[PDB]
Every structure is written in structure tokens, then in C-alpha cells.
Amino acid sequence: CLDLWREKNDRLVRQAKVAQNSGLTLRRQQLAQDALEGLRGLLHSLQGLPAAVPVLPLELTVTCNFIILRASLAQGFTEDQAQDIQRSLERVLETQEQGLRELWDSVLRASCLLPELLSALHRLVGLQAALWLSADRLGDLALLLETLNGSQSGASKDLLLLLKTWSPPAEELDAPLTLQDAQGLKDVLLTAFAYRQGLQELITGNPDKALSSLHEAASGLCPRPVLVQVYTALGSCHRKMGNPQRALLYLVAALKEGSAWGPPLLEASRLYQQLGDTTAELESLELLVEALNVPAPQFLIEVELLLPPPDLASPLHCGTQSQTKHILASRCLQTGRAGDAAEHYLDLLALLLDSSEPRFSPPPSPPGPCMPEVFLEAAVALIQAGRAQDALTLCEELLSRTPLWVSATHLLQGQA
Amino acid sequence: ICATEIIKNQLRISLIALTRKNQLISFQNGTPKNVCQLPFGDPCAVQLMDSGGGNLFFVVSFISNNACAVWKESFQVAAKWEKLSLVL
Amino acid sequence: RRAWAELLAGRVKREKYNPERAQKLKESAVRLLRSHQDLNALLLEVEGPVIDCDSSEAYANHSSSFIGSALQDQASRLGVPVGILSAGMVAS
């Protein structure tokens, strides 16, 4: 019977890998979702027996494959998988209740009794820690890994020491297959955690602690999109320290290795603003405008799972062509090239109003300046250019479509 | 039981079982294949409905006065009625 | 309405970049990041407070191979390619 279940497991793993390598956008997802429901059913068949010491090695391996494949396809975790892990652990305990923390404590004591399933448990710890690192539970993560290693390592409240100290136990001998293994997960953990620690310390204003963790990103698994982002992040660090020539190094490296050169050209615009190189700043933003016109996953836990979405305050925030064309025209108008600024503003405003047919140009939300303020900046640029009739038409249009902005409308209408 | 064949003195039965754990199982020579998971708790009995060309259903009753019709071919819930004083 | 007709802009709507335009863009971006680059400032940042005299250390010798190894050492420290050090020092 274990024979058949094991075979089924192996078959499905191999099917998944085949879809991973080969296949179209459609056929890939087809075979994946097929293997997925195979694994579900197998889980349920195994979940239909009492305990079974010899089954757990599979159950844990299979739930691992299930979680991995589920998460990979969804391109994110959920809490369903938390409860899947909870179920498997309840099962491990039932062999020999409250919450994940006590469960794990009792489970890892029951592992120091030496049931030979550690190569799965450690994998499962990897997966648990991936959930808690996506859901920001870093204190409980620390506690789990402290319990895993000697609790003598209790004061080591650094994760990025515990995660290195954490040793997967075997070479993973002839057991059931897997889409991933303890080390292949630990190596994603170290890089994702260190990357996140780095970005937090940067935004929080310690670009002296950052450089340590942002080099620990590149010294271990680092898919090349993870390295581009590590380099923009170091450009930011050095600009904040007052070393613009070193920041330029890392941003040039990010330009070269990346197919994603938004976050570096933005860091460059901020750098030329810091120095005063305003012509260069406006050229870097022109190139960013041109860069945001131009635009695959794996059935396996990558590192682009365990990153957050960027904050607005982060160096890795890039807006839309529209948001950034406004930054260009704003930053052009403050500098005093009203002609260029006005040209940019009309090519902005047409993109927002004349756009009914094409895909809708991105519109600023609460953080973004209100539409009428944009009409006002446009009319001001127009006036500075000496395009008074066009400023009049703008203001007339605004008032025809619809306070301070009205009084100001009349003001600019006058100056026109 | 669904079917009985006789290879030698021994013999070979395809038999459906169901469990405390809300599961429905197929067997061929005691080879478990095609497990389903039932919605409701504490199933009681199962009967078989033919209903045309190949649309064979196992109709499961429960002590909870409710009942499922799961496919054969794909051990997979097709309907889940409730309160069901009786089933025929 | 005449106001609108005068406002109605044109080369506003633009779509996708030919994949050679992406490389041209990135080329011009790296060109720009290096043009505003300076080595003197780098030597003041990484090393604490440039001529052949700097790399050769106070008129030691004038041997071509010796000066080559000095440029290698300097470039190893700064993480800059040896070419750009050579260029900067020679132009100075």
C-alpha cells in the first residue's frame, strides 16, 4: 500500500517538474493543478488512517509538496497551509492541541526521541518559518529556531545567526522525492530574511547596519532580480551616508545585471538632486519615463515569495509613467525650464483626459496630488512659457467641468 | 460489495467500505484505490444507483439524517441533501 | 470647446519599446552615471585623506611592469576597472 502511495507521490512530483521545465502558459498550469489535486487526494487517503510511524515520512513529505506547489501556483502563502501544517503536527503528536508554539516544542522533543523523519521535519520548519516571515512573526520564528538548535543559543536574538547555525540533518537519503529539501529552503530563508532586515534598517535610518545584511544577500542564493534590488538598496545606503561615487558603482551594476532599471534611475535622480546636477537629474528621469514603457514562475519555493510589496518610503518604490512624468515636470518647473516643463505637462494632461479608448493612465490616490492642483501646475508652467491663451483654455475647461482652487483659477486666468 | 470473480480456489472481490473518518474507499484484491472524503459525519449505509449509461452513484446515508450521492469513475461528491427522513 | 480643440494634444499616446531601445536606454543611463563619476572623490571616500607619483609611491622607479602592478593594486582596492584608473591618471 505504502508502495502505491509513494509511487503516486513520485509520479506527481516528476509530472510537476516536467511541467516546470517544458510547457506553455496553459499546459504548465494544467499539469500542475492536475498533480496538485492528485496530492490532495493522497493527503486525504493518508489522513484517513490513525497514526502510522512508517506513513508520517510520506505524509510530511506530501504536505510539504502540497504546500510548496499550492503556494507556488497562488504566488503567495495563505492560512489554509498553516492549518495543513497544524494537522500534520497534530498527527505526529497523536502517534505519542493548544497552538503552534506548544505543538512545535512537544514535536521537537518527540524528534530528539529520534524518529527518522528529521529530513521532513526540518523541511517543515523551513515551511513554517516561510509562513511566519511572509506574515511578520519574527519573534516566534526566533523562538522556534532557538528551540530547534540548543536553547543555550537563547540570547542570540539575531535570526541571521540562528538560520546559519540551523543544520539540516541528512544528505536526504533514498526517501520519497520532493520539490525541495531542507538546505534548498534554508538558503532561500537566509537571503529573504537578510534582504528584509536590510530594507527595514535603511527606511528606519541606520544605513550603517544595512551594508552588513545587504552584502549577506549576495553571499548565498540570489536570483539576479534579488541582486539588482540589493544593489539599488546599497546605492540608497551610501547616498544617505554622503558617498555618492560609491552609490554610482552599485547602481551601474544594477543597470547591467537587471532587466529592471526603474529603482536605480530613481536613486540616480535623488542623487543628482542631493548634489545639484539638475540637467543630469532631468535626463535620468527622461530615461526612467522611457524605461517604464517597456515591460517566469517555478513549482518550487523561490525567494520572490518571501519579499514584501515595497512601501512608498522605500528606495524600491517605482510609480507609473504618469506619476513619474509629473515628478519630471514638477522638478523641471522648480528648476526653471518652464518651456520643457509646460510641454511635459500638456503631454501629461492629454494622457489623463483624452484617454477613454486605451488602457486608463494611472491616477494618483490620497498620497498623489488632487487633479485640480495638476491643472494649476500645468497653467503655471504654461504662463512661464508664455502660452497664455492655452492657460485660459485650461482654466475655462476646469471650471466648465466643476474654494481655493477656483480663486487660484481666476488668479492664473488673470496672469494669463 | 460491487463484484466477485474467481481466479482459482482463492477469490477476488471489489468491495466498497466506509469509515469513522468520513471516507469512502474502493478495493480490488485489497488494493486501495479511489478514496473520497464525505461532507457529513458518522455514515450509516450505502446503496448503488445505475441511472442511465455509466452515471453510477453510491448513495450514502448518515445518522445525522442527511445523505450524499458520490460518483463512481471519480470518487467525487455530486449532491449533499439534508433532513431526509428516508432514502429509496 | 475652441478651448478644448486648442488643448487636444497628439504625441501624448505612446506604446511599446523595440527591445534594442531597452539596451540603447540602459547604455545612455550607464554613460550618464560614469560621466558624473570621479575617481579623486572615490580615493578620498574609500581610502582616507591622483598622479603616477600616487600609485608608484614618491618617485620609486619608472619601470612599465612595476607601474602596471601598481594600477592593479589600486584598482583592486577601489573595485574600478584598471582602464579607467589609467585614463584618469594619464589625463591628470
For residue B62, what is the DSSP state?
Answer: E
Cβ atoms of A290 and C25 within 8 Å: the answer is yes
Helix or strand run (H / E) with residue A407? helix A404-415
Kindly list the distances between the CA atom of residue A102 and the CA atoms of A7, A89, A180, A306, in Å, as whole numbers in the listed order: 34, 11, 26, 25
Spell out the alpha helix ranges (H) of A113-262. 118-134, 138-148, 159-165, 182-203, 210-218, 225-241, 244-257
Kindly list the distances between the CA atom of residue A144 and the CA atoms of A97, A106, A150, A406, in Å, as whole numbers in the listed order: 17, 11, 11, 61
Residues facing residue B26 across a β-bridge: B33
Question: Which residue in this structure is represented by grid cell 506547489?
Answer: A69
Residue of C nearest to A248 (CA): C33
- What burial letters (b/e) apply to C31-48, b meaning 16+ CB within 10 Å? ebbeebbebeebbebeee
For residue B83, what is the DSSP state?
Answer: -
C71, three cell numbers: 594600477
CB contact under 8 A, A393 and C15: no
- How long a stretch of residues is chain C? 92
DSSP per residue, A51-111 = --TTTHHHHHHHHHHHHHHHHHHHTS--SHHHHHHHHHHHHHHHH----HHHHHHHHHHHH
Q: How was this structure determined?
A: cryo-EM
CB contact under 8 A, A245 and C37: yes
Between A265, A293, A389, which is nearest C14 by CB? Answer: A293
Cβ atoms of B32 and B42 within 8 Å: the answer is no
Q: With contacts defined as CB-CB under 8 Å, which chain C residues touch A257?
A: none
Asked if A41 reaches chain B (Cβ–Cβ under 8 Å), the answer is: yes
CB contact under 8 A, B32 and A41: no
Distance from the Cα of B23 to chain A's closest Cα (Å) equals 7
Kindly report the number of other CB atoms within 10 A of residue A294's CB atom: 14
DSSP per residue, C14-31 = --PPPHHHHHHHHHHHHH
Vertex A8, ends A6 and A14: CA angle to 5°? 100
Q: With contacts defined as CB-CB under 8 Å, which chain C residues touch A256?
A: 26, 30
CB contact under 8 A, A393 and C6: yes
Distance CA(A236)–CA(A240), nearest Å, equals: 6
CB contact under 8 A, A44 and B35: yes
CB contact under 8 A, A251 and C46: no
A321, three cell numbers: 509613467
The answer to whether chain C touches chain A by having 3 or more C-beta pairs less than 8 angstroms apart is yes
CB contact under 8 A, A290 and C45: no
Distance from the Cα of B21 to chain A's closest Cα (Å) equals 6
Distance from the Cα of C2 to chain A's closest Cα (Å) equals 8
